[PDB]
Design a protein around this ligand. Structure first.
Ligand code: MG
Lengths: 62, 426, 29, 61, 59, 50
């Protein structure tokens, strides 16, 4: 009942070495490019900031 | 079970994609219009019952969708997410039966829509519950049906990431971004209008003297967002893209062509666990939905095996909650890998029949030994690929550098797959 | 979506919300 | 690095042989990557390692 | 393994012992019609061939 | 024959590796005149010598 634990823990250390896992250029590319992609979805919150609270003032005031 | 309800329930379907098949950039137009909608969709509701707590599953729930007691989003995409997940469960788990004719499968999508919209109505009713109960229900379904149509017009339509996952991603960009520039603060004992922005920690240098205690409030800010929090948030992003590039290469002699080597990879993400994290999230969202039925017949005793322990103090007052939370996170993502891969593709037979189906044969041995060529990676790179995400989200909670934990890890995982989808068409 | 009205339909729904939100708020202040 | 011969000539016999062994192990691993099926970058790196080995053995001779 | 054609079983045994730090029960050699010599290097059973194959990369 | 020498076997080994077609990138070069390997030996037609 104890040995499948041994199996998976040795099984992990198998496929860690088979992977590539390179340096930073990949890391660099998805890093900067996808923080950029984040902020593409990001400033949208600053525009519901700029809009939907002042029009909620329009809502409650009238 | 399928043969009766599905033929009757066909009410108001969606229109399948036209004959304008190949295009580059009007694809992106159909994306961007939905992104205009979720500019708009996160906007204020019309009913004035101003309840005190915003949502009860507001944090985990917020991580999935953050319009808690808010807009037409709606405290979460938790309707569409939970209703999608248990649907794919009860399709994959054979409690309910496979349809591969283009019809029963069409009405299977119809019943998918049915249970999805009914669950939206259920969430609407259960969050709004006085005598002002009219028309909330009408609003919610209208705004449930809209998210339905926008998601299914971004699977058979444009769809590259999904409708779903890129909604989660962009709303997570926003939830970092409100923490990025933060205009208001209700005034505490000192210091109005500066809450965890970098502008806040640049206006703070303009107001106060004694810049040492201007540094201290900038880097060890607790109740509002922090800039040490933002360093840890950036740090997590860097590490997770360090781990996306973990991939296994397998070169392939194509059949019938001399020596082209388009090596099939297997990244450790194993679909980036958009099942498996949301597997970890939505069960702990459905009870914190249904603790509301525990008030009558709870946020206390049921919480000790329900949630993270939320404390930056690693030796906070209960190790039971910490141990069980982390072990459940790791085991949940690993287990839902080893159960997930069998349904949404890329299991052993899946890969084999796709490669035979696209005429790609491993060099080392015969074509249907390719299974045994690669059956010794995919489950572990499911399971470990499950496991060391959730423990990774442990490091998203154990240390507070995330504009948010688990959910931020996984919405940027959405983005990372998203980049691949966009790049695909180059 | 053989047709694009479903989207347009969603836009109409938001407008109905958009306009009808401030429409009752017209008489209030 | 770019193993140039001019900054191999001042160095000693022992460091030339250790650098030779480092490059021989490096070429062995690139041939493993050629036979298992690896990147294109390793497959173009194999010529860099072969010519660097030729350079080091040349300077030794 | 694929081996240079000028090699003995003794030389293949010493090379496998030195490059990968593993002891060998026996070596069987054949020369292919391609021209290469192939060596089937049996290991002493305290070593796993799958572990040393995962060490050197082949899987 | 099933009984060979090393010399004859190495001779046959070379002719078995010369017997492949041309790679399909070789005719995308600048000054190509080569459409196919015109030295292809088949074992029934041409008997290789010896
Ligand atoms: Mg004859």
């Amino acid at each position: 009942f104890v040995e499948p634990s041994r199996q998976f823990v040795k099984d992990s250390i198998r496929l860690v070495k088979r992977c590539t896992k390179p340096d930073r250029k990949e890391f660099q590319k998805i890093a900067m490019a996808t923080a950029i992609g984040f902020a593409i979805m990001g400033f949208i919150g600053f525009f519901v900031k700029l809009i939907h609270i002042p029009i909620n003032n329009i809502i409650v005031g009238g | 079970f399928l043969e009766v309800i599905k033929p009757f329930c066909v009410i108001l379907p969606e229109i399948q994609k036209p004959e304008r098949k190949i295009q580059f950039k009007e694809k992106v137009l159909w994306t961007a219009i939905t992104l205009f909608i979720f500019l708009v969709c996160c906007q204020i509701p019309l009913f004035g019952i101003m309840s005190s707590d915003s949502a009860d599953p507001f944090y985990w729930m917020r991580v999935i969708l953050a319009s808690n007691r808010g807009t037409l989003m709606e405290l979460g995409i938790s309707p569409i997410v939970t209703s999608g997940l248990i649907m794919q469960l009860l399709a994959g788990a054979k409690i309910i039966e496979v349809g591969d004719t283009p019809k029963d499968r069409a009405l299977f999508n119809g019943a998918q829509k049915l249970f999805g919209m009914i669950i939206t109505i259920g969430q609407s009713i259960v969050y709004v519950m006085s005598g002002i109960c009219l028309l909330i229900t009408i609003q919610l379904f209208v705004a449930g049906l809209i998210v339905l149509l926008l998601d299914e017009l971004l699977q058979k339509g444009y769809g590259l990431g999904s409708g779903i996952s890129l909604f989660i991603a962009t709303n997570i960009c926003e939830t970092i971004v409100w923490k990025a520039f933060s205009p208001t603060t209700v005034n505490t004992g000192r210091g109005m209008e500066f809450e965890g922005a970098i502008i806040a920690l640049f206006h703070l240098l303009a107001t106060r003297t004694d810049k040492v205690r201007a540094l201290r409030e900038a880097f060890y800010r607790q109740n509002l967002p922090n800039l040490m929090n933002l360093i840890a948030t950036i740090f997590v992003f860097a590490v997770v893209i360090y781990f996306q590039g973990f991939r296994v290469d397998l070169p392939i002699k194509s059949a019938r062509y001399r020596g082209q080597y388009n090596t099939y990879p297997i990244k450790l993400f194993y679909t980036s666990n958009i099942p498996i994290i949301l597997q970890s999230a939505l069960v702990s969202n459905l009870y914190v939905i249904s603790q509301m039925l525990s008030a009558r017949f709870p946020v206390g005793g049921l919480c000790h095996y329900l949630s993270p322990p939320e404390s930056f103090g690693s030796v906070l007052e209960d190790p039971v909650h910490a141990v069980v939370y982390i072990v459940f996170m790791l085991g949940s993502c690993a287990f839902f890998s080893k159960t997930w891969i069998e349904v949404s593709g890329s299991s052993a037979k899946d890969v084999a029949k796709q490669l035979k189906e696209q005429q790609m044969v491993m060099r080392g041995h015969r074509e249907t030994s390719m299974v045994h060529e690669l059956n010794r990676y995919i489950p572990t790179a499911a399971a470990f690929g499950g496991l060391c995400i959730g423990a990774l989200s442990v490091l998203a909670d154990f240390l507070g550098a995330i504009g948010s934990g688990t959910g931020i890890l996984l919405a940027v995982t959405i983005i990372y797959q998203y980049f691949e989808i966009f790049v695909k068409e180059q | 979506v053989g047709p694009v009205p479903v989207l347009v339909m969603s836009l109409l729904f938001i407008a109905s919300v958009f306009m009808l939100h401030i429409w009752g708020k017209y008489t209030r202040s | 690095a770019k193993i140039k011969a001019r900054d191999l000539r001042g160095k000693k016999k022992e460091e030339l042989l250790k650098q030779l062994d480092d490059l021989k192990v490096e070429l062995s691993q690139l041939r493993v990557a050629k036979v298992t099926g690896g990147a294109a970058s390793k497959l173009s790196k194999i010529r860099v390692v072969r010519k660097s080995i030729a350079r080091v053995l040349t300077v030794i001779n | 393994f694929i081996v240079d054609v000028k090699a003995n079983k003794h030389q293949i045994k010493q090379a496998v012992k030195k490059l990968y730090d593993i002891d060998v029960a026996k070596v069987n050699t054949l020369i292919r019609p391609d021209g290469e010599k192939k060596a089937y290097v049996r290991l002493a059973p305290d070593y796993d061939a799958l572990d040393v194959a995962n060490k050197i990369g082949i899987i | 024959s099933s009984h060979k020498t090393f010399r004859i076997k190495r001779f046959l080994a070379k002719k078995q590796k010369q017997n492949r077609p041309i790679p399909q990138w070789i005719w995308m070069k600048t000054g190509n005149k080569i459409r196919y390997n015109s030295k292809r030996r088949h074992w029934r037609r041409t008997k290789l010598g010896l």
